[PDB]
Amino acid sequence: GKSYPTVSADYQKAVEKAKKKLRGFIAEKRCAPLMLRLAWHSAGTFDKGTKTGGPFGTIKHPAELAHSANNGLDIAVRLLEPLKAEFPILSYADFYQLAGVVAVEVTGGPEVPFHPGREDKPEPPPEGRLPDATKGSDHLRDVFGKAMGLTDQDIVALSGGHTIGAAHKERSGFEGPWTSNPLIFDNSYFTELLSGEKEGLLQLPSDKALLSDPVFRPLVDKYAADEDAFFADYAEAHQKLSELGFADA
Ligand code: HEM
Ligand SMILES: [Ca+2]
């Protein structure tokens, strides 16, 4: 149920050029996980019942960066600002979603389709919509299913975003990477979740919740067995996340 907007040829050209510049920058600075986190924190505030929040460029505002879940993302916004300045025609909304797509590509992940045309909105959403790492399955369905409108499959596939990056005790309080190879986008998140706790590696309560829910667990097992199936489901879920509230039929 998407009807994407028309954008000018100049807009399209800037998208193409920004994608290239983002690849080089993200690779050089080793910041793919942070850019994926930025894209996710931008989009995951959407509430389908009120049509508020979502990937509309608001995360750059001080009021939204002040949300406690957003500890550390001020760094991401500042890192990208000089590059955004080379592409004045793009919305911030598009630019941050494009950075998220590129972060997955450059770490070896699937090619997530991208459609331009998000408009920047003035008003940030209220604090509190992003999921709590200490809660379990019911909470995950309330946030991704009831608020965002994604499926059970999308929840499990998107949790695999933790295959890259790490938590920090100065940001969330949790500490360490989920995988041995935190700059490579692979299915290691799921093989680690299955094999249990291992000193040096993180599992959040929210990650463990996938192991004991009757619907999530068979999807974990599938993605741990079959990286290609993970990639296909991941790309569909990321595209839906990046488009919440946008171009809805
Ligand atoms: C399912 C619920 C989720 C919860 C509760 C959650 C929670 C967290 C927490 C607590 C952190 C650590 C922040 C820090 O201390 O630096 C984190 C990091 C991260 N999250 Fe998730 N997250 C979830 C879903 C997602 C999704 C859907 C994505 C993307 C598709 C994502 C991508 C990431 C990445 C890449 C990092 C690492 C950032 C870095 O290395 O600096 N997360 N998340
Ligand atoms: Ca990995």
CSV table of C-alpha atoms and ligand atoms in Angstrom, one decimal:
chain,number,residue,atom,x,y,z
A,1,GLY,CA,0.0,0.0,0.0
A,2,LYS,CA,2.6,2.5,-1.1
A,3,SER,CA,2.3,5.3,-3.6
A,4,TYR,CA,5.6,7.1,-3.8
A,5,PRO,CA,5.9,10.8,-4.7
A,6,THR,CA,7.4,12.3,-7.8
A,7,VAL,CA,10.7,14.2,-7.2
A,8,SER,CA,12.6,16.3,-9.7
A,9,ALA,CA,15.5,14.9,-11.7
A,10,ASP,CA,17.8,17.2,-9.7
A,11,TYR,CA,16.6,15.5,-6.5
A,12,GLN,CA,17.2,12.1,-8.0
A,13,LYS,CA,20.7,13.0,-9.1
A,14,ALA,CA,21.5,14.3,-5.6
A,15,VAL,CA,20.3,11.0,-4.1
A,16,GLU,CA,22.7,9.1,-6.4
A,17,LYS,CA,25.6,11.3,-5.6
A,18,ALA,CA,24.9,11.3,-1.8
A,19,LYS,CA,24.8,7.5,-1.8
A,20,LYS,CA,28.3,7.4,-3.1
A,21,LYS,CA,29.7,10.0,-0.7
A,22,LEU,CA,28.0,8.2,2.2
A,23,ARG,CA,29.6,4.9,1.3
A,24,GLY,CA,33.1,6.3,1.4
A,25,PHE,CA,32.4,8.4,4.6
A,26,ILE,CA,30.8,5.6,6.5
A,27,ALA,CA,33.5,3.1,5.6
A,28,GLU,CA,36.3,5.5,6.4
A,29,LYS,CA,34.9,6.6,9.8
A,30,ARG,CA,33.9,3.0,10.8
A,31,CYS,CA,30.5,4.3,12.0
A,32,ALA,CA,28.1,2.1,10.1
A,33,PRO,CA,26.4,0.8,13.4
A,34,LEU,CA,25.9,4.3,14.7
A,35,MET,CA,24.3,5.4,11.4
A,36,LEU,CA,22.0,2.3,11.4
A,37,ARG,CA,21.0,3.2,15.0
A,38,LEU,CA,20.3,6.8,13.9
A,39,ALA,CA,18.0,5.6,11.1
A,40,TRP,CA,16.2,3.2,13.4
A,41,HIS,CA,15.7,5.8,16.2
A,42,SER,CA,14.4,8.2,13.6
A,43,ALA,CA,11.9,5.8,12.2
A,44,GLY,CA,10.8,3.8,15.3
A,45,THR,CA,8.9,6.7,16.9
A,46,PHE,CA,6.0,6.3,14.4
A,47,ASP,CA,2.5,5.7,15.9
A,48,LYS,CA,0.0,4.5,13.3
A,49,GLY,CA,-3.0,5.4,15.4
A,50,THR,CA,-2.1,9.2,15.6
A,51,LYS,CA,0.2,9.4,12.5
A,52,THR,CA,2.9,11.1,14.6
A,53,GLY,CA,6.6,10.5,14.7
A,54,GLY,CA,8.5,8.4,12.1
A,55,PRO,CA,11.3,9.1,9.7
A,56,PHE,CA,10.8,12.9,9.1
A,57,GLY,CA,14.1,14.5,10.1
A,58,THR,CA,13.1,15.5,13.7
A,59,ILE,CA,15.9,13.6,15.4
A,60,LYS,CA,18.3,16.5,14.6
A,61,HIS,CA,16.2,18.8,16.9
A,62,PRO,CA,17.6,19.4,20.5
A,63,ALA,CA,14.3,18.4,22.0
A,64,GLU,CA,14.4,14.9,20.5
A,65,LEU,CA,18.2,14.4,21.1
A,66,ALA,CA,17.5,15.1,24.7
A,67,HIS,CA,15.4,12.0,25.0
A,68,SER,CA,17.3,9.6,27.2
A,69,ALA,CA,17.0,6.7,24.6
A,70,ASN,CA,18.9,9.0,22.2
A,71,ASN,CA,22.1,9.1,24.3
A,72,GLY,CA,25.0,9.2,21.8
A,73,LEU,CA,23.1,10.1,18.7
A,74,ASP,CA,24.1,13.8,18.9
A,75,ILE,CA,27.5,12.4,17.7
A,76,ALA,CA,25.9,10.8,14.6
A,77,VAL,CA,24.0,14.0,13.7
A,78,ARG,CA,27.1,16.2,14.0
A,79,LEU,CA,29.2,13.6,11.9
A,80,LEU,CA,26.8,13.9,9.0
A,81,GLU,CA,26.2,17.6,9.0
A,82,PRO,CA,29.1,18.6,6.8
A,83,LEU,CA,28.1,16.0,4.2
A,84,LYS,CA,24.4,17.1,4.3
A,85,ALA,CA,25.6,20.6,3.6
A,86,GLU,CA,26.9,19.4,0.2
A,87,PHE,CA,23.3,18.3,-0.7
A,88,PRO,CA,21.0,21.2,0.3
A,89,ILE,CA,18.2,19.9,-2.0
A,90,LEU,CA,17.7,16.6,0.1
A,91,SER,CA,15.5,16.5,3.1
A,92,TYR,CA,17.2,15.5,6.3
A,93,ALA,CA,14.6,12.8,6.5
A,94,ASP,CA,15.8,11.2,3.3
A,95,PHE,CA,19.4,11.8,4.1
A,96,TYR,CA,19.3,9.9,7.4
A,97,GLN,CA,17.3,7.0,5.9
A,98,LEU,CA,19.8,6.9,3.0
A,99,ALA,CA,22.6,6.7,5.6
A,100,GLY,CA,20.9,3.7,7.3
A,101,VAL,CA,20.6,1.9,3.9
A,102,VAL,CA,24.2,2.6,3.1
A,103,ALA,CA,25.4,1.4,6.5
A,104,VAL,CA,23.9,-2.0,5.8
A,105,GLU,CA,25.4,-2.1,2.3
A,106,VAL,CA,28.9,-1.2,3.2
A,107,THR,CA,29.1,-3.8,6.0
A,108,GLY,CA,28.2,-6.5,3.5
A,109,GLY,CA,24.4,-6.7,4.1
A,110,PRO,CA,21.5,-6.7,1.6
A,111,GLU,CA,20.7,-3.9,-0.8
A,112,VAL,CA,17.6,-2.3,0.8
A,113,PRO,CA,15.5,-0.4,-1.8
A,114,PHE,CA,15.3,3.3,-1.2
A,115,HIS,CA,12.6,5.7,-2.4
A,116,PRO,CA,13.1,9.4,-2.0
A,117,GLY,CA,10.5,12.1,-1.1
A,118,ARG,CA,10.2,12.3,2.8
A,119,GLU,CA,9.4,15.9,3.9
A,120,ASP,CA,11.0,17.3,7.1
A,121,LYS,CA,8.4,17.9,9.8
A,122,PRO,CA,8.7,20.6,12.4
A,123,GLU,CA,7.5,18.8,15.5
A,124,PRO,CA,9.3,15.9,17.3
A,125,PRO,CA,7.2,13.0,18.8
A,126,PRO,CA,6.8,12.6,22.5
A,127,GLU,CA,9.4,10.8,24.5
A,128,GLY,CA,8.9,7.1,25.3
A,129,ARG,CA,8.0,5.3,22.1
A,130,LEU,CA,11.2,3.4,21.5
A,131,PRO,CA,11.4,-0.1,23.0
A,132,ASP,CA,12.9,-0.8,26.4
A,133,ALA,CA,15.8,-3.3,26.3
A,134,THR,CA,14.7,-4.8,29.7
A,135,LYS,CA,11.2,-5.9,28.6
A,136,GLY,CA,10.1,-8.9,26.6
A,137,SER,CA,7.8,-10.2,23.9
A,138,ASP,CA,4.6,-8.5,24.9
A,139,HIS,CA,6.4,-5.1,24.9
A,140,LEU,CA,8.0,-5.8,21.5
A,141,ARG,CA,4.6,-6.5,20.0
A,142,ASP,CA,3.1,-3.4,21.6
A,143,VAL,CA,5.8,-1.2,20.0
A,144,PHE,CA,6.4,-2.8,16.6
A,145,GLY,CA,3.0,-4.2,16.1
A,146,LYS,CA,0.5,-1.9,17.7
A,147,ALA,CA,2.4,1.4,17.3
A,148,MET,CA,4.4,0.9,14.1
A,149,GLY,CA,2.2,-1.7,12.3
A,150,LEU,CA,5.0,-4.2,11.5
A,151,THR,CA,4.7,-8.0,11.6
A,152,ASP,CA,6.1,-10.7,13.9
A,153,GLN,CA,8.6,-11.6,11.2
A,154,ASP,CA,9.8,-8.0,10.8
A,155,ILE,CA,10.4,-7.9,14.6
A,156,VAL,CA,12.8,-10.8,14.5
A,157,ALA,CA,14.5,-9.8,11.2
A,158,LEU,CA,15.0,-6.2,12.4
A,159,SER,CA,16.5,-7.4,15.8
A,160,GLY,CA,19.2,-8.8,13.6
A,161,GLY,CA,20.4,-5.3,13.1
A,162,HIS,CA,22.4,-6.0,16.3
A,163,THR,CA,24.7,-8.2,14.2
A,164,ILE,CA,26.7,-4.9,13.8
A,165,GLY,CA,27.8,-2.6,16.6
A,166,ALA,CA,27.9,-2.6,20.4
A,167,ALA,CA,26.3,-1.1,23.4
A,168,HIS,CA,28.2,1.4,25.7
A,169,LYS,CA,27.9,1.7,29.4
A,170,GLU,CA,28.0,5.5,29.1
A,171,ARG,CA,25.1,5.5,26.7
A,172,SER,CA,22.5,2.8,27.5
A,173,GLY,CA,24.4,1.2,30.4
A,174,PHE,CA,24.7,-2.1,28.6
A,175,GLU,CA,28.2,-2.8,27.3
A,176,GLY,CA,29.8,-4.7,24.4
A,177,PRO,CA,29.1,-6.2,21.0
A,178,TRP,CA,26.6,-8.9,20.2
A,179,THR,CA,29.0,-10.6,17.7
A,180,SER,CA,32.7,-11.4,17.2
A,181,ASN,CA,32.6,-9.4,14.0
A,182,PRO,CA,30.7,-6.2,14.8
A,183,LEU,CA,31.4,-4.5,11.5
A,184,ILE,CA,30.3,-7.3,9.3
A,185,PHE,CA,26.6,-7.7,8.5
A,186,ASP,CA,25.9,-11.4,8.7
A,187,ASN,CA,23.6,-13.9,10.6
A,188,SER,CA,26.0,-14.2,13.5
A,189,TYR,CA,23.6,-12.3,15.9
A,190,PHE,CA,21.2,-15.4,15.7
A,191,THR,CA,23.9,-18.1,16.0
A,192,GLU,CA,25.2,-16.3,19.1
A,193,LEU,CA,21.7,-15.9,20.6
A,194,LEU,CA,21.3,-19.7,20.2
A,195,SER,CA,24.6,-20.8,21.6
A,196,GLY,CA,24.1,-18.9,24.8
A,197,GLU,CA,26.0,-16.3,26.9
A,198,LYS,CA,29.7,-16.0,26.2
A,199,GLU,CA,32.0,-13.7,28.1
A,200,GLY,CA,32.8,-10.6,26.0
A,201,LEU,CA,29.4,-10.7,24.1
A,202,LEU,CA,26.1,-9.0,25.0
A,203,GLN,CA,22.6,-10.2,24.9
A,204,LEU,CA,19.9,-7.8,26.0
A,205,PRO,CA,16.7,-9.1,27.7
A,206,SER,CA,14.9,-7.9,24.6
A,207,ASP,CA,17.2,-10.2,22.4
A,208,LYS,CA,16.6,-13.2,24.7
A,209,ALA,CA,12.9,-12.7,24.5
A,210,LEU,CA,13.0,-14.0,20.9
A,211,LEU,CA,14.2,-17.4,22.1
A,212,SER,CA,11.2,-18.2,24.3
A,213,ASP,CA,8.3,-16.8,22.2
A,214,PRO,CA,6.5,-19.5,20.1
A,215,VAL,CA,6.3,-17.4,17.0
A,216,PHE,CA,9.7,-15.6,17.2
A,217,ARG,CA,11.8,-18.7,18.0
A,218,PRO,CA,11.3,-20.6,14.7
A,219,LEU,CA,12.4,-17.4,12.9
A,220,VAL,CA,15.5,-17.2,15.0
A,221,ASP,CA,16.2,-20.9,14.1
A,222,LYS,CA,15.6,-20.2,10.4
A,223,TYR,CA,17.9,-17.2,10.3
A,224,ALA,CA,20.7,-19.0,12.1
A,225,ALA,CA,20.5,-21.7,9.5
A,226,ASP,CA,20.0,-19.7,6.4
A,227,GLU,CA,21.7,-16.3,6.0
A,228,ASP,CA,20.0,-15.7,2.6
A,229,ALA,CA,16.6,-16.0,4.2
A,230,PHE,CA,17.7,-13.5,6.9
A,231,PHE,CA,18.9,-11.1,4.2
A,232,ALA,CA,15.7,-11.3,2.2
A,233,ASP,CA,13.5,-10.8,5.3
A,234,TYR,CA,15.8,-8.1,6.7
A,235,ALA,CA,15.6,-6.0,3.5
A,236,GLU,CA,11.8,-6.2,3.4
A,237,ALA,CA,11.6,-5.2,7.1
A,238,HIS,CA,14.1,-2.3,6.8
A,239,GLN,CA,12.4,-0.9,3.8
A,240,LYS,CA,9.1,-0.9,5.7
A,241,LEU,CA,10.6,0.7,8.8
A,242,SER,CA,12.3,3.4,6.7
A,243,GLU,CA,9.0,4.2,5.1
A,244,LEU,CA,6.6,4.3,8.1
A,245,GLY,CA,4.2,7.1,7.8
A,246,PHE,CA,5.5,7.9,4.3
A,247,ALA,CA,3.7,7.5,0.9
A,248,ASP,CA,0.9,5.4,2.5
A,249,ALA,CA,-1.7,4.6,-0.1
B,1,HEM,C1,14.1,-4.7,19.3
B,1,HEM,C2,14.3,-3.6,20.1
B,1,HEM,C3,15.5,-3.0,20.3
B,1,HEM,C4,16.0,-2.5,21.5
B,1,HEM,C5,15.4,-2.7,22.8
B,1,HEM,C6,17.2,-1.9,21.2
B,1,HEM,C7,18.1,-1.4,22.1
B,1,HEM,C8,19.4,-1.1,21.9
B,1,HEM,C9,20.3,-0.6,22.9
B,1,HEM,C10,20.0,-0.5,24.4
B,1,HEM,C11,21.4,-0.3,22.2
B,1,HEM,C12,22.7,0.1,22.9
B,1,HEM,C13,23.0,1.6,22.7
B,1,HEM,C14,24.4,1.9,23.4
B,1,HEM,O1,24.6,1.7,24.6
B,1,HEM,O2,25.3,2.5,22.6
B,1,HEM,C15,21.3,-0.6,20.9
B,1,HEM,C16,22.3,-0.4,19.9
B,1,HEM,C17,22.1,-0.7,18.5
B,1,HEM,N1,21.0,-1.0,17.9
B,1,HEM,FE1,19.3,-1.7,18.9
B,1,HEM,N2,17.5,-2.0,19.8
B,1,HEM,C18,16.4,-2.6,19.2
B,1,HEM,C19,16.2,-2.6,17.9
B,1,HEM,C20,17.0,-2.2,16.9
B,1,HEM,C21,16.7,-2.2,15.5
B,1,HEM,C22,15.4,-2.5,14.9
B,1,HEM,C23,17.9,-1.8,14.9
B,1,HEM,C24,18.2,-1.6,13.4
B,1,HEM,C25,17.6,-2.3,12.4
B,1,HEM,C26,18.9,-1.6,15.9
B,1,HEM,C27,20.2,-1.3,15.7
B,1,HEM,C28,21.2,-1.1,16.6
B,1,HEM,C29,22.5,-0.9,16.3
B,1,HEM,C30,23.2,-1.0,15.0
B,1,HEM,C31,23.1,-0.7,17.5
B,1,HEM,C32,24.6,-0.4,17.9
B,1,HEM,C33,25.0,1.0,17.8
B,1,HEM,C34,26.5,1.3,18.0
B,1,HEM,O3,27.3,0.4,17.8
B,1,HEM,O4,26.9,2.4,18.5
B,1,HEM,N3,18.4,-1.9,17.1
B,1,HEM,N4,20.0,-1.0,20.6
B,2,CA,CA,28.3,-9.6,12.8
